[PDB]
């Protein structure tokens, strides 16, 4: 049987990668970071509180100018926040209230959102009269949209519930490149600092690395236990972290091709919803389903702080490009900024 | 310097805040419902009598605003996007009572929804659809009861149960036996936070919206009593 031979060929190939990965694992990150100093207890207090959203907040994104941010809530509203003065800047109604993600253009001229409607919408913030209007609607996905990130004013990468990721041309509205290979639902994605590659996680306890320029899966990472909910790139672009339903966070390396460090605790039996790093990459901040956010020492895997200023589960998290503040959203319809 | 710009920013905030205050009144004035069901349940006819990945339908009963969402064109894996309906007023569940052991599959789906941690505070309205088809199959002896579920041999009509006018006892036992199957799961893991409302309905029953309106009234009434801690 050809199918049996192919299964045996795949099994032998999987064994070869396991042997190759085993040889490179002469040590672990914990052993290397054994003699370094701990980061110390991290104490942070809320500085700002943004109110006005009606339903639960599902996503948020910082701008490049580090004071403007956009947030999405499931009541069908996009609000642009001036974090310095707390004043609202824009209020964009949505065609569908079941929004699941939002994004901010690097130039600050556009915002994007998407959800259960399988459509990604682009809004123009620099209209002649100053009133926000929709600019383009991208369609073609057969599943709910989970995340989207801009590359420039004309390009964007999206992820969907159809186990597929795609790259779009905003001006023409066409799908330039399609990424396939995942078996489970794709929940999050993050672009590299040079925007030449991006990583994503799916509901199959696996992560994959893609090449944007020519559209193939370069590397595949396993080791997690359940569906992966969050993913983000390390500041240097040579590592990434993943949060899963197994109440355990993990760190990977693109050159080592295997797991480097695992973050877990006995009392934590709830999954991770959001993951993000700091500017130096020494601190790893993650949101949890138990209505709090914890701070992890990436090098030492020791919990260095806890944020418990939310009445519901933390659904989104973000760090400014300047590294000067951290903003978190939750199902209690409140945005909190910490420093 | 920047005081003029700062004043211009605050006047923009207050203008936005007035619109958001008006939108808050409208948002709370409508009740959101999630329409869910197994295959061949007939929910398409129900939603018809009151591509994109979701559908919307608006209807009014006694000047009350309702907004029903039908989740279509989505993948069969459901454990992720089901969490978006954790705050809806109620979840309408439609099953094929007449029916490869499709009834067992519906029971497992109902059990998972009932025991989901994010849906433990949401009540479920259950419609035992295809009542007419169930009666015909039972009369002709084609229904596969006593094969899917051997428990039908020892089952008896409930004491508080009342048969329909002119209804033969054979179909009355069959329809109630399926009804108690869902109640067995509903009874367990219940602490009064959510309830189940089973109804025997047909695909073309025009009074389905009235059943939802009455069931939503009870849910709201119990919700108010819970805040005052009377219950």
């Amino acid at each position: 049987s050809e199918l049996d031979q192919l299964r045996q060929e795949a099994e032998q190939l999987k064994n070869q990668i396991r042997d190759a990965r085993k040889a490179c694992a002469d040590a672990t990150l914990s052993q290397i970071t054994n003699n370094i100093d701990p980061v110390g207890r991290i104490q942070m207090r809320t500085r700002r509180t943004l109110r006005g959203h009606l339903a639960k907040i599902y996503a948020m994104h910082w701008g490049t100018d580090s004071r403007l941010l956009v947030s999405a809530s499931q009541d069908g509203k996009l609000i642009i926040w001036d974090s310095y003065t707390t004043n609202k800047v824009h209020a964009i109604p949505l065609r569908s209230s079941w929004v699941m993600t939002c994004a901010y253009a690097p130039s600050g001229n556009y915002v994007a959102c998407g959800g259960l409607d399988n459509i990604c919408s682009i809004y123009n913030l620099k209209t002649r009269e100053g009133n926000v209007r929709v600019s383009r609607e991208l369609a073609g996905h057969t599943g709910y949209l989970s995340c989207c990130r801009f590359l420039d004013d004309n390009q964007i990468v999206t992820s969907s519930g159809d186990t597929t990721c795609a790259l779009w041309d905003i001006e023409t509205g066409q799908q330039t490149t399609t990424f396939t290979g995942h078996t489970g639902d794709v929940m999050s994605l993050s672009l590299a600092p040079d925007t030449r590659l991006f990583v994503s996680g799916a509901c199959d306890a696996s992560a994959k690395l893609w090449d944007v320029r020519e559209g193939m899966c370069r590397q595949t990472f396993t080791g997690h236990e359940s569906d992966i909910n969050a993913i983000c790139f390390f500041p240097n672009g040579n590592a990434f972290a993943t949060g899963s339903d197994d109440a355990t966070c993990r760190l990977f390396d693109l050159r080592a091709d295997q797991e480097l460090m695992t973050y877990s605790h006995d009392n934590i039996i709830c999954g991770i919803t959001s993951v993000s790093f700091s500017k130096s990459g020494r601190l790893l901040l993650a949101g949890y389903d138990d209505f709090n956010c914890n701070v992890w020492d990436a090098l030492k895997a020791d919990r260095a702080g806890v944020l418990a200023g939310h009445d519901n589960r933390v659904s989104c998290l973000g760090v400014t490009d300047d590294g000067m503040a951290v903003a978190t959203g939750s199902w209690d319809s409140f945005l909190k900024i910490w420093n | 310097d920047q005081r003029n710009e700062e004043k211009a920013q605050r006047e923009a905030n207050k203008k936005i805040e007035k619109q958001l205050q008006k939108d808050k009144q409208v948002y709370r004035a409508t009740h959101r419902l999630l329409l869910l069901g197994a295959g061949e349940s007939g929910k398409n006819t129900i939603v018809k009598q009151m591509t994109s990945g979701i559908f919307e339908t608006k209807f009014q009963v006694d000047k009350v605003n309702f907004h029903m969402f039908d989740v279509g064109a989505q993948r069969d894996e459901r454990r992720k996007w089901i969490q978006c309906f954790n705050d809806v007023t109620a979840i309408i569940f439609v099953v094929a009572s007449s029916s490869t052991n499709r009834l067992q599959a519906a029971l497992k789906l109902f059990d998972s929804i009932w025991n989901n941690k994010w849906l433990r505070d949401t009540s479920v309205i259950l419609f035992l659809n295809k009542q007419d088809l169930l009666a015909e199959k039972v009369l002709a002896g084609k229904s596969k009861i006593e094969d899917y579920f051997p428990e039908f041999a020892r089952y008896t009509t409930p004491e508080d149960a009342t048969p329909e006018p002119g209804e033969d006892p054979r179909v009355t036992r069959a329809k109630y036996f399926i009804r108690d199957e869902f109640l067995r799961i509903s009874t367990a893991s219940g602490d009064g936070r959510h309830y189940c409302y089973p109804h025997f309905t047909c695909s073309v029953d025009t009074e389905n919206i009235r059943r939802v309106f009455n069931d939503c009234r009870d849910i709201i009434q119990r919700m108010h009593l819970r805040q005052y801690e009377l219950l």
Partner: nanobody, 128 residues
């Protein structure tokens, strides 16, 4: 990588007996609920039986009650299905499935067309 490998089964006379063994590796076996799912030829996935984390709770589908029996071994990280008095209808491909979440009672997508935590399965044929 999460792996579920099944073993056993094969040709059997009607009214005979068979034993199915599920080999579990790569995950904590005691933290998850396990289910048995079979697929008859020309039909879709169907749920057969399940067992709780510690084995205190057991449930079967009505059509196989008494005939089949499910057991779990935490130490060996394996799951069993004892089959007795097999009928011709019992012929199908039996898969070993896991619930997607740990420390959780409910679990979805077990009988879905595509599932990331389902085994390859073994073929069971009942005929003379």
């Amino acid at each position: 990588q999460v792996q579920l490998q099944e073993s056993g089964g094969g040709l059997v006379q009607p009214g005979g007996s068979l034993r199915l063994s599920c080999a579990a590796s790569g995950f904590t076996f005691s933290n998850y609920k396990m289910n048995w799912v079979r697929q008859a030829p020309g039909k879709g996935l169907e749920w057969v039986s399940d067992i709780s984390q510690s084995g205190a709770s057991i449930s079967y589908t009505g059509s196989v009650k008494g005939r089949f029996t499910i057991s779990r071994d935490n130490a060996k990280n394996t799951l069993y299905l004892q089959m007795n008095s097999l009928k011709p209808e019992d012929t199908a491909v039996y898969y070993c499935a896991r619930c997607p979440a740990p420390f959780t009672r409910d679990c979805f997508d077990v009988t879905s067309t595509t599932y990331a935590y389902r085994g390859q399965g073994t073929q069971v044929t009942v005929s003379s």
